[PDB]
Amino acid sequence: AATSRDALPNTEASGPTHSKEIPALTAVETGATNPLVPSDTVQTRHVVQHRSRSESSIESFFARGACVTIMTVDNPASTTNKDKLFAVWKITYKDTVQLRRKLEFFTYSRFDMELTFVVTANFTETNNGHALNQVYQIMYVPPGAPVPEKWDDYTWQTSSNPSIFYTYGTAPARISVPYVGISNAYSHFYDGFSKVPLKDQSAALGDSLYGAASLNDFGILAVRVVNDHNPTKVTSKIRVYLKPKHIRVWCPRPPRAVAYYGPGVDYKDGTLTPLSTKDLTTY
Amino acid sequence: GLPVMNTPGSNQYLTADNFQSPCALPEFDVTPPIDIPGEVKNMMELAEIDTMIPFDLSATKKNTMEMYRVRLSDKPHTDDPILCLSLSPASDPRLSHTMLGEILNYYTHWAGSLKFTFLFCGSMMATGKLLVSYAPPGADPPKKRKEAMLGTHVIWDIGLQSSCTMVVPWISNTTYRQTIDDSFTEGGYISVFYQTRIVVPLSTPREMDILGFVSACNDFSVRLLRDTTHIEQKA
Amino acid sequence: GLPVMNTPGSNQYLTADNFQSPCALPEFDVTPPIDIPGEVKNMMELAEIDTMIPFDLSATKKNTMEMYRVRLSDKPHTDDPILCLSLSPASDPRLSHTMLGEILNYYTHWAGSLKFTFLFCGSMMATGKLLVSYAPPGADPPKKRKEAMLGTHVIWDIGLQSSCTMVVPWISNTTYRQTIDDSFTEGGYISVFYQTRIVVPLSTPREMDILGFVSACNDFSVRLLRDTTHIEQKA
Amino acid sequence: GLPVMNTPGSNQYLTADNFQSPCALPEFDVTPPIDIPGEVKNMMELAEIDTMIPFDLSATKKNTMEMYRVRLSDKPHTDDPILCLSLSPASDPRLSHTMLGEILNYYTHWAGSLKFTFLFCGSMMATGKLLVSYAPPGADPPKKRKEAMLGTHVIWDIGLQSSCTMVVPWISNTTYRQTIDDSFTEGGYISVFYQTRIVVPLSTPREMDILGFVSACNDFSVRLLRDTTHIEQKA
Amino acid sequence: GAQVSSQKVGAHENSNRAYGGSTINYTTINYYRDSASNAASKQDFSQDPSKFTEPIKDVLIKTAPMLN
Amino acid sequence: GAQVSSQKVGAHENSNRAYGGSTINYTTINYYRDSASNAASKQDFSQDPSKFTEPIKDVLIKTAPMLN
Amino acid sequence: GAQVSSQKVGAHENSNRAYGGSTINYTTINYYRDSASNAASKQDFSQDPSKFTEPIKDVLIKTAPMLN
Amino acid sequence: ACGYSDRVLQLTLGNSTITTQEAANSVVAYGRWPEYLRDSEANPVDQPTEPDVAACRFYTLDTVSWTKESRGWWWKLPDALRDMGLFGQNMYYHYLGRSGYTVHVQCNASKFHQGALGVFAVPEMCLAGDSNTTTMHTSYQNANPGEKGGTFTGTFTPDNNQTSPARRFCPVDYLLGNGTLLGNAFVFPHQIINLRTNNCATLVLPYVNSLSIDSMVKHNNWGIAILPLAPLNFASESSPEIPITLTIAPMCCEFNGLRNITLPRLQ
């Protein structure tokens, strides 16, 4: 019944005292934190508190949609000596600091990823040319499926691969995805290995990187330029914005203190110093 | 069919917008949730858990253990502050990183009473009385027990019950204060002084240290979410 | 009329999307369906029908009949596996093509207990006891009856009832396993050994062969559809 | 789904349009309103509060205090107007700035009866009778008490009750008048004359001044909002 | 002539109703006169795999001996 | 199958109802069969911070002495 | 959860109802959960100009003498 | 009534019994106390084995000496035990093992010493390695120290050897080893043993993990990390030394899918 948009317990009035009751004194060893209300260390009046935590709720903290990655792709002239560029990004929030620190406050999470795409595009070369409104294909290639070889190959036939055909210049594309986790919460922090080493085997044959779980959890995104090699080479960028909608979090871990380094919690030297200076006796 | 009219604001994407959108994997049998020990329903819950304040931030002692140990001595009673602190559970470098102060940067307005808890970490024999004090803004910060004394203080005692907590009652001119070092929405001033002196018997460590913790009270709340300055993504 | 607003995600085609669309042939009198013998309502139904495992995949014996006949002999009792198999009803070349293993590639997560059925295809006289066994992952695969024996086994008997079935109970750390040779979501290990030896009387074929079949149980289910690697369209 | 049709007037922004639009800060806990002393529910409320008319606008006396003091003397009774004024609570420079006349520029049509209130600001001894008068348009403006007298007048008296108010009854050919100096929708003519003369005893200031105030009555109302000419933004 | 049905929500927080109780529905409206134009209602069934797994001119009891 | 709920208006003038009295509602309609496609209903709850603040193998009375 | 209200028609011919009788209404539907997103309902009130026109530590009768 | 004052306890899980006398009324991870797997949320289909008393009892690991230059210690529970009686043998024998815990960190001084040991029980404690070149490359043999456990360090030291590296964790203390401030670390289930008062800390940790029951040989769950908050001092003496010693007890544990014995390359 106590929803997020209620109204903090109104401040009760309170006069002098001289009781053997000792609210003020704690003892942090117990790990428990004294739930002392303002009403204890001072005489308080009867304030009718209207303010509510309706905005700090776990749902609202992650109410904005963060940018998980950018993806460069380009359609060059047929006569191009180089193969046509089709970017392929492996679904995993861990690419940019922002959304990665928010999620990282919690040990485990169960959310419904609601991916949106703001696709842009300019003419590379100095050459003064034209290009009929391009259309892009954003194929979701599920963990284990065959990742696209050439730009135009069979893999793109997409008989069973959830794909979106975005026409340039239009309301930015959006596809909601339900908890696609193998477990019961995406583990923001995995302690342990994906293969245990066994004595009756070579040090290699059975090794593995710490913290890594599934080879392809979330999946991979194949994005091509669907049209054919056009005289005027046009490069494009597909910025994907992931916004965790129906979300839940567990175990409140302390926020990242020093600059992120790689997919693993590991940290580079130098960046190791986070705090700022201040005299132990200056306001 | 049905004559409609596209309204100013159509084809417009708004990051924090909330509209229903086609599902990429139709029918996908979602895996049933288990009952994992330790859920969290609202950020301000975390705000009510004490986190040790790194009181000392001297070039030498910063970014290293020594930063949380506020040393006290058996020096002859003086009337000078054995720590200060600008109530800005967001701005002041001393609080800017504590869970509370770390969550406070992801917001533009904080409110409600805070509760500083101090733990005497030293020899069971050592005794003494420390005066933890707060004085709302707009007046010379307190630099002498004589001046700080006048404000809101809890003359604490180093005994069996090893810790204290001086609630800083939400006394402010606005309903919420800027979570940035703004002058109009000033915080106030916190400062612990010796009400006596830490007296010790012979063959005792003459230099014990105190650790301070800070947390919000079931009154505190924040609003208007933003991006914390705390972590940068270089290139 | 009616002021509407085009929302982020408009004019967007989504292959697996499900929206009503204008009908090309309006009124076309569809032909009434008859009751054709043999309907199918759900793929996992097919998954519950045994399909012979091509156990031998040796350059010589592969892609040819000899590939499904697992030969057994009247050799003096040994403690070595007369077949192995990595429980990966999707990954292991040995299962990758069987109906079950063929449907498993059109998916990203499989689950539920499987059931391997072995048929002794040899002279009515020949007898013997074969120990079909399974051992959940994370331990040295079993290479001796002495080690495999410790796991989950069904010490089968070559008699009147010509076939057996060792159910491999769904014992796994996740609710579904990756239908790709992933290390974290490892399958386990299956392996038939001679519990005695195939003993035969005089004037009998001394080298009979066994055929293995595999299928899912009313527990098995798959999710998150994909494109099978199995068939390529060159140019 | 649902076959719709974009209607003439789609994707069209209309400044004064009123359509629901996505919220930028979803959930933001708005701060509860207090009960601030002095609310206003409708502009025409302000229109009913008197504001002193700057009657004199002579190059010398304009834009300076002297502009609101309409001086009267103890001169021997004459039949000439001691002030004029074109009823155009919007157009005539004399009214164009008063609250009433200042709000009237933010509109294209005004209506209802106005009420001019005059305050005798002079020596408690000085007495006299001033004839404040109004004559609807379409006739030679009144320049002699003899001609103004014929119209709608209130022959006021300088006594204990220091002020008077001549209501100008809404007498007009249209339901509202152009808040611009339009000829068809003419206002009329206001003009105070001495009905006797301001007589004073010896040792009294022989040149006292009168201040005029103007305001609307619970009948007045305006319509069709526009941008006041009064304040320009150069570059 | 609304076609309101219940979705199969995985009791997700603040989805409308879950482990706090409640159900989740969704409105549908066939818009075209021609049936072959309706949205694939996904409310499909499931038969017993028996017409393929257990097809015999008799009956098979599992605890019994196969080849009687 | 309309999902009409009450907004939490800050009693704003001429918003429909406030300090003159009245309430404010908003219609919602789940349109897609797949739940993970519904609009985040924002009607989320709030538990007591106790499983983190006050977690002990006993009970803690504030007016009492901590370390008994 | 329709919000049907009456427009203030100026009894115009064939507008739905006027000098032949009848009333005119218009449907409204708050669509967003956040109140500060609703259409300015324009059904605003009007107080008496007294707290500004007639503000005195007593009462003023018009037919009476001002400065009593 | 009587001396049932919070300060004295008498833990008895299994056939072992702890009876401390300065006891700071114990912590129960997240209110949630350890229990068996309810059929409603179970996963693997065989019969789960349950050592019960055979395992559930208290196992003392090995003691750590505590000086002035001491920078902290860290254990990886699921693993930390791997030897300790049957919970050691059952540990390896099964592919799946869900186990709860009761860590009792023992350490007492005289009324004349001083210092505070923050005993933090971090769920999914992923400590960071030490190779500025490649990330996570930390070796297993090295990643799971068992009965002995590892130890936090003063300042980070990058592993340069690259013909072949040292592949270890280089866990800095102010960053709780996982690159996140210690002063903020008081968010995990914890107790500060503050020499003046209590002479032990008892945290009961219920199995926490994204899965119903998971592995053990592989994946770790809880990890204890004891850090000296208030450095130890005693009398104008060069250096003092008190010995901190933890005793853990695996509670409501169960294991699935028996096999052949696992024998990891721990050397």
PDB file of N, CA and C in Angstrom, chain C residues 30 52 61 71 76 83 93 97 117 140 161 165 174 219 225:
ATOM      1  N   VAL C  30     -12.454 -18.437 -49.582  1.00  0.00           N
ATOM      2  CA  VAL C  30     -11.420 -19.405 -49.182  1.00  0.00           C
ATOM      3  C   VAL C  30     -11.983 -20.821 -49.220  1.00  0.00           C
ATOM      4  N   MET C  52      17.536 -41.612 -34.803  1.00  0.00           N
ATOM      5  CA  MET C  52      18.794 -42.302 -34.683  1.00  0.00           C
ATOM      6  C   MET C  52      20.007 -41.380 -34.728  1.00  0.00           C
ATOM      7  N   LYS C  61      33.730 -43.670 -42.350  1.00  0.00           N
ATOM      8  CA  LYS C  61      32.330 -43.991 -42.074  1.00  0.00           C
ATOM      9  C   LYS C  61      31.302 -42.849 -42.126  1.00  0.00           C
ATOM     10  N   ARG C  71      29.186 -50.538 -33.728  1.00  0.00           N
ATOM     11  CA  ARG C  71      29.571 -51.938 -33.549  1.00  0.00           C
ATOM     12  C   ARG C  71      30.123 -52.292 -32.177  1.00  0.00           C
ATOM     13  N   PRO C  76      37.243 -59.700 -24.935  1.00  0.00           N
ATOM     14  CA  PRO C  76      37.366 -59.930 -23.484  1.00  0.00           C
ATOM     15  C   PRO C  76      37.168 -58.617 -22.679  1.00  0.00           C
ATOM     16  N   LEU C  83      31.742 -45.691 -26.951  1.00  0.00           N
ATOM     17  CA  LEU C  83      31.097 -44.480 -27.454  1.00  0.00           C
ATOM     18  C   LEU C  83      31.112 -43.409 -26.348  1.00  0.00           C
ATOM     19  N   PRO C  93      28.646 -32.547 -32.969  1.00  0.00           N
ATOM     20  CA  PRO C  93      28.400 -33.065 -34.287  1.00  0.00           C
ATOM     21  C   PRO C  93      27.596 -34.353 -34.253  1.00  0.00           C
ATOM     22  N   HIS C  97      22.370 -33.073 -35.971  1.00  0.00           N
ATOM     23  CA  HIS C  97      21.470 -33.316 -37.102  1.00  0.00           C
ATOM     24  C   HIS C  97      20.164 -34.072 -36.825  1.00  0.00           C
ATOM     25  N   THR C 117      17.606 -43.735 -26.291  1.00  0.00           N
ATOM     26  CA  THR C 117      17.111 -45.120 -26.423  1.00  0.00           C
ATOM     27  C   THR C 117      18.041 -45.972 -27.297  1.00  0.00           C
ATOM     28  N   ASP C 140      36.465 -34.226 -14.681  1.00  0.00           N
ATOM     29  CA  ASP C 140      37.078 -34.940 -15.828  1.00  0.00           C
ATOM     30  C   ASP C 140      36.107 -35.882 -16.501  1.00  0.00           C
ATOM     31  N   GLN C 161      13.267 -57.863 -24.420  1.00  0.00           N
ATOM     32  CA  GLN C 161      12.908 -56.462 -24.615  1.00  0.00           C
ATOM     33  C   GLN C 161      14.200 -55.868 -25.152  1.00  0.00           C
ATOM     34  N   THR C 165      16.215 -47.146 -22.439  1.00  0.00           N
ATOM     35  CA  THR C 165      16.183 -45.705 -22.511  1.00  0.00           C
ATOM     36  C   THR C 165      16.668 -45.110 -21.204  1.00  0.00           C
ATOM     37  N   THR C 174      21.407 -23.195 -14.848  1.00  0.00           N
ATOM     38  CA  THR C 174      20.568 -22.122 -15.397  1.00  0.00           C
ATOM     39  C   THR C 174      19.234 -22.702 -15.837  1.00  0.00           C
ATOM     40  N   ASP C 219       8.730 -32.137 -20.875  1.00  0.00           N
ATOM     41  CA  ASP C 219       9.310 -31.249 -19.897  1.00  0.00           C
ATOM     42  C   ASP C 219      10.130 -30.249 -20.697  1.00  0.00           C
ATOM     43  N   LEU C 225      13.878 -17.857 -31.131  1.00  0.00           N
ATOM     44  CA  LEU C 225      14.108 -18.325 -32.515  1.00  0.00           C
ATOM     45  C   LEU C 225      15.265 -17.665 -33.285  1.00  0.00           C
TER      46      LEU C 225
END
